[PDB]
């Protein structure tokens, strides 16, 4: 299962040079310094860098990079990517349901799952939880093991692998390394970039690519770097660890002849002989939604202290607000309370949606590793994530509030005059959280995202319609009031609630208002803020909130589609 | 400069056992596993754990722990503690001005500073910036060097040191280790707990304490662990790194005889012979304020993109608000605008103070390492930090707002009716930020702090006085309205601004109000919200905000004083 590469001159501005050498079966390694070219070479060789920077040829047993390459090549990321909240058996199933062909039945699929969990000994914990924050069933020793397995259901012949042991110390380290050694010669050409190994794991490599400063410096077998550096003229610290000795060479013991001293050695020509010798999606959309939805939903359930907690806090907020605004009399202090509670519901619905940006910034690493592999298409991931986490998390705090407070406060007592409030809170929640999605769909750090969203929401709240009479704003600023979501929410709620009311005890102003400074009816307070009264005057706010949703969602889908996946 | 310790039976519930052994001059080491007892032993031996858990005796050349011990013992923390924004020479001065006796003049102090920066070669960069986030002049190789120096101005004979090389790779690592080797036998008994060293630095140790699982397992010289484990019956991987070989022993190659196999060896009795043989603040308050103030102020200046940025954003907020509320007419839409802008100003002075909690949670590590050492007294640190960062950062956004918006908006045009607004904004800023200090004075993670503060501020804003008429709240909730800072700010601003106004064009209500539903004067809107009108009715809010400051500051000082400094 050879992987003869040839002249990988990658230019992002290089990061590499005319590398050579082939990686026969066994257990090939990439020693390197911390960040010279090692990880970059393992990325470029695993079809993980955009080809426009690569300017050379690679091969696969003699055929230049078939299209469905990643379909037959695993590549396990260095840091964990497995969903901790799910359990090992279900993680293996989720990896098996999306990437291997669904012409076979579920039966042989579970059969292969048991085959993998024995060829990678884990029936130890074949149903334990892995966990991230609030529960930690298994440890790293099994985390990396299930990460190695998660790409072994498809059974590729080239198991790419980067920095297996960074974060594991000696015991589990030797465990996973001997595991690699063993499951290698079932015919699997592992290619892993280790970070200062020991000598006890230096036993069996068959290959190692001492590469530093963007230039190759040795590509012989494992039992040859010792001899190569012997002929180079060093004692190598008679008792030492050579795998650290070579690094001790590169750092400060210079370079533009140390890289040069190798091409003249035997190994360059040794391999380059055979180099020049050889020189002459799968599934539907249905599954890719029906499984991403399951995974994200059961994940949401897995660590409930994140979401369920704010459900408790929204119940408490609803109850405390019902306690404060219990009466809602119809006297001069009726307008203040009524335009206060609705205001405080809308801006609340808004600023409690900035906590739904991590829908796409916690797992950018996971989404990216998944999409570079042939799991699904970005539209499927998007719709699944929405239908799983946005939809049933923003739909509850629109029913807790409006069922708890509506009868305590004693607002307009009608059926539709209640369902309209529920629906408008739902709409403003969805629209604000979708804007939150549109802003933070691409980043990886959440600081600037949360900052921008909190500033935008503050400005929208200023233009909401309570802190300033929207008719007295200057002409060249009144055009800004259309970008504000709290306006479209608060106006709809007001128009729902303020219509048939009379806020002046003893004075019937509906026939005519005496003294014309009084706001002795709901219509007068509603027009005084510049709000329509025709039935369109309400649903105009919903056709305007059903539009900010679609715009702020297609912007998010585009930001996901056009994101550099390399 | 020996440090013979004896039977350190620490109990937090142990973490250690009857350890023995002495640490003669040279370069003593603490190998250990990742977290067994190594770091804990180096902490307990450096007078860094509260003695109530220690139940044994230590010695210092024959005298049991003099009171001014840390006055003559450095202990450089593992992770960086140096202020990155300052520059190396000024960091060394700041360490020299607080901890060494101020009877000598500044002259010999700078002389010793040059002596140190040559004995620790850094005139390379003796004025470069170190930097944290936004500027990164020097690298880790000099960061750890200046951290090692920062405690060498006092010149202690016992230079405690924990994990020098964790985060430095080979080149600078060998640099600092050989530096330790060299500056050792000017007579300095370094005691450092290294984390899986190499053999190239395994040259010269004179000592090493292989301690794991809370129990000692070897305390011979450096050239003896090899022989001890020879007589123990292991080949030690003929070519390998022994410093990793011993760890390879402990992990899984068991314990309750491997610790037992040593006491019977020669070294236990070897040392325990001489064990049983030997068995029978500085400165004023003036300096400690005048220097913490300088350091914190120049630090604030060092990375200005943190503070100066929100000064830009407060200028922008002031200008945009001046643009929105330009007119402020005196008609029916005058009360809404006037009670809107003041509300927004108060609520923004509050919420924008929740960003001043990191005054004491970014450097809890630094304050703690500094106070365990004899730098200053906690009251000095407190007053300096206040006078340096709280005072001139909360005083500007009270002058940007009230000078930008007061003449655009065209509020009450008088001198004192302007300085009172400025002063009230200053008071509410100080009071809210002091509450922020009182909540987050002890923690180390800022998540729960910011969450609690945002919830408290949200509740105070509900009870502010605009979203609900404070006279219609039920009797058993009206007692809550006294805990709210936005109330005490917004009420003062209103009472300042609403007194002599007439908000009804053409109707002179000051003589008598017709139709009694009109709010045709400022007094009526001011009483309708339950606010006094006597001149005391305003300053009552300032005697109530000058009290929440003192309470929320003494609570912070107590939380700093009673914090576990170990």
């Amino acid at each position, epitope marked *: 299962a050879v992987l003869s590469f040839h002249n990988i001159c990658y230019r992002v501005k290089e990061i590499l040079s005319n590398i050579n050498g082939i990686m026969k079966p066994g257990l090939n390694a990439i020693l390197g310094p911390t960040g010279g070219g090692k990880s970059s070479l393992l990325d470029v060789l695993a079809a993980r860098k955009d080809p426009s920077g690569l300017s050379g040829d690679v091969l696969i047993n003699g055929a230049p990079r078939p299209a469905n390459f990643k379909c037959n090549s695993g590549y396990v990321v260095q840091d964990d990517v497995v969903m901790g909240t799910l359990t090992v058996r279900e993680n293996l199933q989720f990896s098996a349901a999306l990437r291997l062909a669904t012409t076979m039945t579920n039966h042989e699929k579970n059969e292969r799952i048991n085959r993998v969990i024995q060829e990678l000994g884990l029936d130890k914990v074949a149903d334990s939880k892995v966990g991230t924050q609030f529960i930690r069933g298994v440890s790293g020793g099994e985390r990396k093991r299930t990460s190695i397995g998660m790409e072994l259901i498809t059974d590729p012949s080239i198991l790419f692998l980067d920095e297996p042991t960074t974060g594991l110390d000696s015991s589990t380290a030797n465990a996973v390394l001997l595991l690699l050694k063993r499951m290698s010669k079932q015919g699997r050409t592992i290619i892993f970039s280790i970070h200062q190994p020991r000598y006890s794991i230096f036993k069996l490599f068959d290959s190692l690519t001492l590469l530093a400063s963007g230039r190759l410096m040795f590509h012989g077998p494992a039992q040859e770097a010792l001899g190569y550096f012997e002929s180079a003229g060093y004692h190598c610290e008679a008792y030492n660890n050579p795998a650290d000795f070579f690094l001790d060479i590169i750092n400060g013991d210079l370079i533009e002849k140390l890289a040069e001293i190798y091409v003249n050695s035997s190994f360059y020509k040794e391999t380059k002989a055979e180099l020049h010798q050889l020189s002459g999606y799968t599934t539907s959309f249905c599954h890719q939604l029906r499984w991403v939805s399951k995974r994200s939903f059961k994940n949401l359930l897995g660590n409930p202290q994140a979401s369920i907690a704010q459900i408790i806090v929204t119940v408490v907020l609803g109850l405390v607000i019902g306690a404060i605004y219990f009466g809602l009399k119809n006297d001069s202090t009726g307008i203040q309370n009524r335009a206060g509670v609705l205001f405080f519901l809308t801006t609340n619905q808004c600023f409690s949606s900035v906590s739904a940006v991590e829908l796409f910034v916690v797992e950018k690493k996971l989404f990216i590793h998944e999409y570079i592999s042939g799991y699904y298409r970005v539209s499927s991931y998007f719709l699944g994530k929405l239908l799983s986490d946005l939809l049933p998390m923003r739909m509850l705090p629109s029913i807790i509030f409006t069922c708890i407070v509506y009868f305590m406060l004693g607002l307009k007592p009608k059926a539709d005059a209640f369902f309209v409030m529920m629906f408008t809170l739902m709409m403003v929640a969805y629209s604000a959280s979708s804007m939150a999605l549109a802003i933070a769909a691409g980043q990886s750090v959440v600081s600037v995202a949360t900052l921008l969203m909190t500033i935008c929401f503050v400005f929208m709240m200023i233009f909401s319609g309570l802190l300033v009479n929207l008719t007295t704003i200057a002409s060249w600023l009144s055009w800004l009031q259309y970008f504000s979501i709290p306006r479209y929410g608060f106006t709809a709620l007001q128009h729902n609630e303020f219509l048939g009311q009379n806020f002046c005890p003893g004075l019937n102003a509906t*026939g005519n208002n*005496p003294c*014309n400074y009084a706001t002795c009816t709901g219509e007068e307070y509603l027009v005084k803020q510049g709000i329509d009264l025709s039935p369109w005057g309400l649903w105009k706010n919903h056709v305007a909130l059903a539009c900010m949703i679609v715009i702020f969602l297609t912007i998010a889908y585009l930001k996901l589609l056009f994101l550099k996946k390399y | 400069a020996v440090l013979s310790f004896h039977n350190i039976c620490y109990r937090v519930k142990e973490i250690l056992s009857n350890i023995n052994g002495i640490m003669k001059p040279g370069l003593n080491a603490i190998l250990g596993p990742t977290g067994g007892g190594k770091s804990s032993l180096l902490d307990v031996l450096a007078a860094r754990k509260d003695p109530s858990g220690l139940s044994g005796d230590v010695l210092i050349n024959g005298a049991p722990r003099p009171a001014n011990f840390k006055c003559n013992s450095g202990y450089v923390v593992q992770d960086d503690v140096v202020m990155g924004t300052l520059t190396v020479r000024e960091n060394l001065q700041f360490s020299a001005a607080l901890r060494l006796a101020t009877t000598m003049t500044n002259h010999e102090k700078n002389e010793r500073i040059n002596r140190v920066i040559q004995e620790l070669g850094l005139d390379k960069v003796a004025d470069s910036k170190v930097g944290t986030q936004f500027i990164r002049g020097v690298s880790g190789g000099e960061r750890k060097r200046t951290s090692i120096g920062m405690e060498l101005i006092t010149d202690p004979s016992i230079l405690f040191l924990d994990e020098p090389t964790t985060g430095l790779d080979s080149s600078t690592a060998n640099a600092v280790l050989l530096l330790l080797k060299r500056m050792s036998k000017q007579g300095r008994t370094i005691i450092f707990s290294i984390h899986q060293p190499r053999y190239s630095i395994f040259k010269l140790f004179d000592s090493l304490t292989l301690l794991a699982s809370g129990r000692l397992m070897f305390h011979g010289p450096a050239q003896e662990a090899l022989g001890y484990f020879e007589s123990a019956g292991y080949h030690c991987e003929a070519y390998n790194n022994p410093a990793d070989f011993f760890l390879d022993i402990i992990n899984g190659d068991l314990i309750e005889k491997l610790a037992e196999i040593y006491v019977n060896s020669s070294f236990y009795k070897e040392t325990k012979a001489e064990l049983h043989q030997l068995s029978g603040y500085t400165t004023s308050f003036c300096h400690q304020l005048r220097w913490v103030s300088k350091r914190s102020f120049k630090n604030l200046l060092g990375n200005p993109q943190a503070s100066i940025a929100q000064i830009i954003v407060t200028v922008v907020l002031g200008l945009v608000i001046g643009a929105i509320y330009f007119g402020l007419k005196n008609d029916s839409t005058g009360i809404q605008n006037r009670a809107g802008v003041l509300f927004f100003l108060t609520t923004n002075q509050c919420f924008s103070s929740v960003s001043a909690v990191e005054l004491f949670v970014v450097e809890k590590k630094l304050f703690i390492h500094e106070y365990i050492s004899g730098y200053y007294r906690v009251s000095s640190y407190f007053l300096g930090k206040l006078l340096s960062d709280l005072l001139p950062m909360r005083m500007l956004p009270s002058i940007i707002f009230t000078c930008i918006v007061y003449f655009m908006l065209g509020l009450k045009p008088k001198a004192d009716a302007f300085f009172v607004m400025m002063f009230t904004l200053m008071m509410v800023a100080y009071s809210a930020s002091s509450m922020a200090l009182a909540i987050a004075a002890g923690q180390s993670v800022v998540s729960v702090a910011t969450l609690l503060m945002t919830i408290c501020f949200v509740f105070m804003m509900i009870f502010s006085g605009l979203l609900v008429n404070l006279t219609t709240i039920a009797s058993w909730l009206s007692w809550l309205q006294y805990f709210s800072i936005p109330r005490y700010g917004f009420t003062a601003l209103q009472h300042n601004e609403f007194l002599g106004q007439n908000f*009804c*064009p*053409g109707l*002179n209500a000051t003589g008598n109000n017709p139709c009694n539903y009109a709010t045709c004067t400022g007094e009526e809107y001011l009483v309708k919200q339950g606010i006094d009108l006597s001149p005391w009715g305003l300053w009552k809010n300032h005697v109530a905000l000058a009290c929440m400051i003192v309470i929320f500051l003494t609570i912070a000082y107590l939380k700093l004083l009673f914090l576990k400094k170990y």
Partner: antibody
Amino acid sequence: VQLQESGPGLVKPSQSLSLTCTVTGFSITSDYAWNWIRQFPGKKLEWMGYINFDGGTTYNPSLRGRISITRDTSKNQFFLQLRSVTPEDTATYYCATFYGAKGTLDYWGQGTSVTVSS
Amino acid sequence: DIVLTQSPSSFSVSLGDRVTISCKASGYILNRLAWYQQKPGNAPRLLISGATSLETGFPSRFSGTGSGKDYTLSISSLQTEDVGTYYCQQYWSTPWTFGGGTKLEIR
């Protein structure tokens, strides 16, 4: 309660204009707001601003800075000052008087016929 | 602003025909539309406030109706002293805009 309008019955363009409506029977600094309704020759009224009882004013936005109403409250007058007069506003000016707590221009002057021509 | 328009900008009635005048607004006035009655050579004297009330010194013929936008005055069997244009005038917004006003024709 009893208004009277009296000023120059001719101006030239780009000059100014003053009209000096002398209230009587009521102190203009006591209760109401006082207006300056003008009517074109095609019989179509325009508002043209008011001066409140305390001293504040508010002008018809269609008149940008071309109008300024002031009051010499010693003899309870209140004046009109229209500047840069176009020869089109050959109106009539009527010196109206707001009420505030009822809303209607209860009392009106007699109106002069300003003619803005050479 | 709010442009008050009276589409029937001229009428032609006989001495007794219960004629009405319609003054539709361009926003929402909320019964704040007042009617004046200019005579040929005088100042418009108030006729109806609040769109429903009357003014002491006037008969009980005149009477206002309508709400929201479409307000109407309704003279009942106009007598001889009833000629002369009729201007509506909202007073809800800040620039108070009158109307075109409808003369009256005696057959």
